[PDB]
Amino acid sequence: ARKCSLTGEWDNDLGSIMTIGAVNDNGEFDGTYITAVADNPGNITLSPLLGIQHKRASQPTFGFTVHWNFSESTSVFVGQCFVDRSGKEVLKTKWLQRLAVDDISDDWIATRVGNNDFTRQ
Amino acid sequence: RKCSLTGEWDNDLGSIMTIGAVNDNGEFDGTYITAVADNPGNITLSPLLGIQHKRASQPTFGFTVHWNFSESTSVFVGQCFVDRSGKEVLKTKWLQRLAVDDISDDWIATRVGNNDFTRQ
Amino acid sequence: ARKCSLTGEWDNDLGSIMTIGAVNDNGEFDGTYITAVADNPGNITLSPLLGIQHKRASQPTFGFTVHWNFSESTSVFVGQCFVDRSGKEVLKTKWLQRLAVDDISDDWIATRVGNNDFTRQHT
Amino acid sequence: ARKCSLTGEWDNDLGSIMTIGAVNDNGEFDGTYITAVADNPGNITLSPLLGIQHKRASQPTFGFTVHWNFSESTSVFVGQCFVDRSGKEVLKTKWLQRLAVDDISDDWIATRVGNNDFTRQ
Ligand SMILES: O=C(O)CCCC[C@@H]1SC[C@@H]2NC(=O)N[C@@H]21
Ligand SMILES: O=C(O)CCCC[C@@H]1SC[C@@H]2NC(=O)N[C@@H]21
Ligand SMILES: O=C(O)CCCC[C@@H]1SC[C@@H]2NC(=O)N[C@@H]21
Ligand SMILES: O=C(O)CCCC[C@@H]1SC[C@@H]2NC(=O)N[C@@H]21
Secondary structure, rough: OOOOOOOEEEOOOOOOOEEOOOOOEEEEEEEEEOHHHOOOOHEEEEEEEEEEEEOOOOOOOOOOOOOOOOOOOOOEEEEEEEOOOOOOEEEEEEEEOOOOOHHHHHHOEEEEEEEEEEEEO | OOOOOOEEEEOOOOOOOEEOOOOOEEEEEEEEEEEOOOOHHHHOOEEEEEEEEOOOOEEEEEEEOOOOOOHHHHHHHHEEEEEOOOOOOEEEEEEOOOOOHHHHHHHOOOEEEEEEEEEE | OOOOOOOOOEEEEOEEEEEEEEOOOOOOOEEEEEEEOOOOOOOOOEEEEEEOOOOOOOOOOEEEEEEOOOOEEEEEEEEEEEOOOOOOEEEEEEEEEEEOOOOOOOOOHEEEEEEEEEEEEOO | OOOOOEEEEEEOOOOEEEEEEEOOOOOOOEEEEEEEOOOHHHHHOEEEEEEEEEOOOOOOEEEEEOOOOOOOOOOEEEEEEEEEEOOOOEEEEEEEEEEEOOHHHHHHEEEEEEEEEEEEE
C-alpha cells in the first residue's frame, strides 16, 4: 500500500472514527463514519461516506461527503494528506455541515464550518 | 420527483453541472464544467461524486469534484428547495482545497464560497 | 466622499441594514447594525460594530465585528468594495457567526459561515 | 485581572503573536498582530487590529479585524474564550482572510478560511 492512499481506518481530534474502502483507478472511494459528536449525540449511528482523492501526488488533495443516517444533515470534508519523513500520515481537513431548514428564507442559518486532523487508528 | 438532483444545472458563475441517476441510498455521480479556475485556459470537464437525502421534498446533499486539470479538489454542501410554483434551487456553500508542498503551509490552502444552482 | 468609503448606509441581501460613521485616518470605523434575521428574531435590537478598511485602494478590502446586544453571539464580516463604471458600489462579503457554548468540548458546533452582498441605500 | 479579558499578550498555534490593549466599557479593544505566516513572509510587518468582546459572560465570545499593513488583505477572527478548572484560558477562533482582486467577477477566489487557538504568553 502506498502512503496517502485513504484506504484504512482513521480517527480525528474529536474522537470520530472513519473507515475508507478500496480506492479505484479514478480515486473514488466509499467508507463509514462514526462521529463522536452531533446536534443530538444520543441519536448517533454509523453513516456512509463517498469521496474522491487525487493519486499522482504523494501528498494528494481529497474530499468526501457524509450522509448522516440519523439526521437530515449532510457534511463534506476537504483536505490534503501529508506524510512526514518517518512516514506518519496526517489528513488536514476543513469541513462544512449543512442542516436542513424548511424555508429557503432560513438558508443563512444552516451551514457550520470547522476543521479536523485525522491520523491512522 | 422535484429535488432529485439528476439532470442539468447551472450556477451564478456560469458553471454547468450534470448529475446522473440517484441510487436507492442517495448516491450519484456527475460531471462539472467550471466557468472559472486558477488557470482557466486549462479547464476541462471533471467528475463528481456525492450523496443526497431521498425522502425529504427539500433534501440536503453534498458532493466532491475532482478537478482533472489541477491538483485541487472542491466540495459543495447544500439543500434543494422547491417553491410553491415547482421551481428548484440548490443553495450551496463550498470549500476548495489547494495542494501545498508542506504541512506547515496548510493554513493557506482552503478557500470558501457559495453558489446557487437552478435547472439548465 | 470617495467611492468605497464605508461611511454611510448599506442594505444587504437578507434585509439587514448598517450605518457607518466617519472612517479615521487609519481606516477605522464604527457603526450600528440592524439585522433582519437571528436565532431568536423577537429579541432583535440594534447592535454596535467596529472595523477597519484599506483607504487608498480604488476597490478596498475591509472587515468588521458586530457585538450582538441581544444574544451572546458575535459576528465578523470581511470583504471587498467594488465600483462599476457607472459608480455603483457593491460590498462582497463573507461572514462567520460565533455562538456561545458552555464547554470547550462543544467548540466544534459553534461557528456558522455565510455570505452577504451590501449596496448603498438609495438617496 | 478577570479571566477572559482579552487585554494582554497571546500566541497561536502557527506562532503568531498579538498584543491587545485595554478593553473599554463597551468591550472594544485594539492591538497589534504579528503574523508568523503570510503569502510572502519576507514582507511581514506589524499590523493593527480592532475588535469587540462580550464583557459579562465568564467565557465570552469576541471578534476582531486585522488590517495587514504589508498587503491589500484583511483578516477577521471570531471565537470564544474558555477557562478550565486550573484557570488556563484558551481562545478558540476561526478566521477568514480576504484577498484583493481586480474585479467583482474574480470575487469567488478571494476568501480563505481557517482556525487558530491562542493561549497567553
Ligand atoms: O449532527 C448531526 O446531525 C450529524 C453529525 C455531524 C458531525 C460533525 S461533521 C464535522 C465534525 N467532525 C466530526 O468528526 N463530527 C462533526
Ligand atoms: O481552480 C481550480 O484549480 C479548479 C476549479 C475550481 C472552481 C471553483 S469550485 C467553487 C467555485 N464554484 C464554481 O462553479 N467554480 C469555482
Ligand atoms: O442570531 C443572533 O444571535 C445575532 C444575529 C446574527 C445575524 C447574522 S450575522 C450574519 C448574517 N448576516 C446578517 O445580516 N444577519 C445574519
Ligand atoms: O498574507 C497576508 O497578506 C497577510 C497575512 C495573513 C495571515 C493569516 S490571518 C489567518 C492566519 N492566522 C495567522 O496567525 N496568520 C494567518
